Design a protein around this nucleic acid. Structure first.
Ligand SMILES: [Mg+2]
Ligand SMILES: [Mg+2]
Ligand SMILES: [Mg+2]
Ligand SMILES: [Mg+2]
Ligand SMILES: [Mg+2]
Ligand SMILES: [Mg+2]
Ligand SMILES: [Mg+2]
Ligand SMILES: [Mg+2]
Ligand SMILES: [Mg+2]
Ligand SMILES: [Mg+2]
Ligand SMILES: [Mg+2]
Ligand SMILES: [Mg+2]
Ligand SMILES: [Mg+2]
Ligand SMILES: [Mg+2]
Ligand SMILES: [Mg+2]
Ligand SMILES: [Mg+2]
Ligand SMILES: [Mg+2]
Ligand SMILES: [Mg+2]
Ligand SMILES: [Mg+2]
Ligand SMILES: [Mg+2]
Ligand SMILES: [Mg+2]
Ligand SMILES: [Mg+2]
Ligand SMILES: [Mg+2]
Ligand SMILES: [Mg+2]
Ligand SMILES: [Mg+2]
Ligand SMILES: [Mg+2]
Ligand SMILES: [Mg+2]
Ligand SMILES: [Mg+2]
Ligand SMILES: [Mg+2]
Ligand SMILES: [Mg+2]
Ligand SMILES: [Mg+2]
Ligand SMILES: [Mg+2]
Ligand SMILES: [Mg+2]
Ligand SMILES: [Mg+2]
Ligand SMILES: [Mg+2]
Ligand SMILES: [Mg+2]
Ligand SMILES: [Mg+2]
Ligand SMILES: [Mg+2]
Ligand SMILES: [Mg+2]
Ligand SMILES: [Mg+2]
Ligand SMILES: [Mg+2]
Ligand SMILES: [Mg+2]
Ligand SMILES: [Mg+2]
Ligand SMILES: [Mg+2]
Ligand SMILES: [Mg+2]
Ligand SMILES: [Mg+2]
Ligand SMILES: [Mg+2]
Ligand SMILES: [Mg+2]
Ligand SMILES: [Mg+2]
Ligand SMILES: [Mg+2]
Lengths: 119, 73, 88, 101
RNA sequence: GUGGGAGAGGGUGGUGGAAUUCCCGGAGUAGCGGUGAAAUGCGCAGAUACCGGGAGGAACGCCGAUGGCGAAGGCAGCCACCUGGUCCACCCGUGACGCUGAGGCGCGAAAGCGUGGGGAGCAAACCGGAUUAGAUACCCGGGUAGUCCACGCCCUAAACGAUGCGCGCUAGGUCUCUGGGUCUCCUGGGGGCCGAAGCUAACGCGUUAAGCGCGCCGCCUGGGGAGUACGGCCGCAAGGC
């Protein structure tokens, strides 16, 4: 057991799942969660509620490691990314900041047919 | 909208071709690394067009960002 | 490319009389300069096509001027040709 | 002959010796490539927007030279051979274009 | 001719960062993925998510436009070189040297062919999972050619403004890109919109003509049979005229 107490919280949000990895200041994960980590299975994972549960789980799991304050990073644009942020926001865990890191390419790789009409 | 400020009106005479001048150049990027549209820069077609290249140069040189993470959110 | 120096050299060289910039002789000369330079450019860069069109056009112009010259003064024509080393 | 500007970003970590050696190698390269130096601003250590070679900083040289164009590219190539040279940007000079004056 | 201008016009070499994938390492645990819902698939040989390092290929976010350039096809990170066109000012030179153009010659998106390479992502065909009455499809997981490079072929197209080229003539208004000027504005070259006169079957066009004229080329002659058959020419072939 580490007992970090100052850390990072990554919210990875897609239209399918939301998944929350909580690392330490050097970015190594500690605990994590997701719609699947909680009981959810199908499309129900990409729920905003599912998200909330995931966030809170990650947060409590991380409390166990004695974490207190955390910087947030948000990647991906998905249902209940924001809900994840709310959850974390009052988990009792302190959010010292949010940041949106969602990656975009400068047009490198051809998307799948699903994603075309843009490259 | 974007009537809040025109980046051109902010400062006076400067060399649109100076890719080494960071303090002024930064003014034309956004919170993200993005180059501000004409709406924001208040430049002309030609002006803006020159700014583009000079800025890119400054990026490659390492003085300006290609991209920035978004704070708050 | 072609420095204004080289250009002048060829102009004064072909001018019919001092101060003649635009006579058939001069034109044809300049044209030949541009032409050879572009031909050399296209010996390498065999893949640069648009330039090539440029050259088709240059050549057309040259041949039209020459045609005109022969029509008007076959002496001046023969002379110019001999000098430039044209007729391919 | 044409007027260019040679931007050189080299390793910030360089101790005096090694840096004088670099600058030396650059003088040499320039000469061998036939570039006369009209002027130089040595800006030195400054903070890069993005890390280059895993270095948050970089050391900046700027020359303005007159050199035969036929050789310009070669010069750049030479400048880059140095491990210590992280960025080389050579531009054709241009008169300043202004806004608001 | 001289002095200038803008430009993803072309070619060669270089180079930059973002992302994807893969490899290496750390930390970490039971799921990830995906959908209408799912399943196949992937993961305890530790995936997903996260940090670090590395390899490789392809394309260039913002700027970016209602924009620009090009004869067209088409052209978009940045840098240098090599190079085509074009516009403006001066009104300096030549003195009708002009226009068009059957044939010829060249260029010609994608796909496709040949010989080498390359191969990250995508993805015909194919292999699967679903859906369905069936589903040789739509959706999902894979995936080969191909997509990329070189060289040589192919010569098509809703190759579209479905509008051949040139010149003269016939209200304006408005927005715009780019020159020049005595720079409220004027003037020249493009790109748009609305509209005089006029045209048009109509819709619409209208100084970017689809108006008024002259010159030259191409083409049409009811629908189908048919872009077929036959012949010829070209092509390695597919196939093209
Ligand atoms: Mg899901
Ligand atoms: Mg000129
Ligand atoms: Mg170009
Ligand atoms: Mg190019
Ligand atoms: Mg990468
Ligand atoms: Mg690993
Ligand atoms: Mg398992
Ligand atoms: Mg299994
Ligand atoms: Mg075990
Ligand atoms: Mg297994
Ligand atoms: Mg990595
Ligand atoms: Mg590989
Ligand atoms: Mg055009
Ligand atoms: Mg087109
Ligand atoms: Mg270079
Ligand atoms: Mg040019
Ligand atoms: Mg006169
Ligand atoms: Mg006279
Ligand atoms: Mg072709
Ligand atoms: Mg092709
Ligand atoms: Mg085949
Ligand atoms: Mg795929
Ligand atoms: Mg199937
Ligand atoms: Mg049915
Ligand atoms: Mg079927
Ligand atoms: Mg079935
Ligand atoms: Mg499978
Ligand atoms: Mg598929
Ligand atoms: Mg084959
Ligand atoms: Mg092939
Ligand atoms: Mg080819
Ligand atoms: Mg037609
Ligand atoms: Mg047709
Ligand atoms: Mg007609
Ligand atoms: Mg003509
Ligand atoms: Mg003006
Ligand atoms: Mg107009
Ligand atoms: Mg108009
Ligand atoms: Mg009327
Ligand atoms: Mg009517
Ligand atoms: Mg109209
Ligand atoms: Mg008509
Ligand atoms: Mg008839
Ligand atoms: Mg009939
Ligand atoms: Mg018929
Ligand atoms: Mg056919
Ligand atoms: Mg036959
Ligand atoms: Mg045969
Ligand atoms: Mg044909
Ligand atoms: Mg035909």
């Amino acid at each position: 057991k580490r007992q970090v107490a100052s850390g990072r919280a990554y919210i990875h949000a897609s239209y399918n799942n939301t998944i929350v990895t909580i690392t330490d200041p050097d970015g190594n994960p500690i605990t994590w969660s997701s719609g699947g980590v909680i009981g959810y299975k199908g499309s129900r994972k990409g729920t905003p509620y599912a998200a909330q549960l995931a966030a809170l789980d990650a947060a409590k799991k991380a409390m166990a490691y004695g974490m207190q304050s955390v910087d947030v990073i948000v990647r991906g644009t998905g249902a209940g990314r924001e809900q994840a942020i709310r959850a974390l926001q009052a988990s009792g865990l302190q959010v010292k900041s949010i940041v949106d890191d969602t990656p975009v390419p400068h047009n490198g790789c051809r998307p799948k047919k699903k994603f075309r009409k843009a490259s | 909208p974007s009537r809040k400020a025109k980046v051109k009106a902010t400062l006076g005479e400067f060399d649109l071709r100076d890719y080494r001048n960071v303090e002024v150049l930064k003014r034309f990027l956004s919170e993200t690394g993005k180059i501000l549209p004409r709406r924001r820069t208040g430049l002309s077609a030609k002006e803006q067009r020159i700014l583009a290249k000079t800025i890119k140069r400054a990026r490659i040189l390492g003085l300006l960002p290609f991209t920035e993470k978004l704070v708050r959110k | 490319p072609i420095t204004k120096e080289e250009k002048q050299k060829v102009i004064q060289e072909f001018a019919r009389f001092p101060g003649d910039t635009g006579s058939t002789e001069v034109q044809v000369a300049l044209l030949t300069l541009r032409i050879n330079r572009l031909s050399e450019h296209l010996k390498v860069h065999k893949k640069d096509h648009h330039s090539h069109r440029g050259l088709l056009m240059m050549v057309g112009q040259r041949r039209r001027l020459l045609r005109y010259l022969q029509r008007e003064d076959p002496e001046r024509y023969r002379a110019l040709i001999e000098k430039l080393g044209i007729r391919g | 002959m044409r007027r260019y500007e040679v931007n050189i970003v080299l390793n910030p970590n360089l101790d005096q010796s090694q840096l004088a050696l670099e600058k030396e190698i650059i003088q040499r390269a320039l000469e061998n490539y036939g570039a006369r130096v009209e002027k130089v601003e040595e800006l030195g250590l400054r903070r890069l927007a993005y890390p280059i070679a895993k270095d948050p900083q970089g050391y900046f040289l700027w020359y303005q030279v007159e050199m035969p164009e036929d050789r310009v590219n070669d010069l750049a190539r030479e400048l880059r051979i140095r491990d210590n040279v992280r960025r080389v940007m050579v531009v054709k000079s241009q008169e300043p274009f202004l806004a608001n004056a």
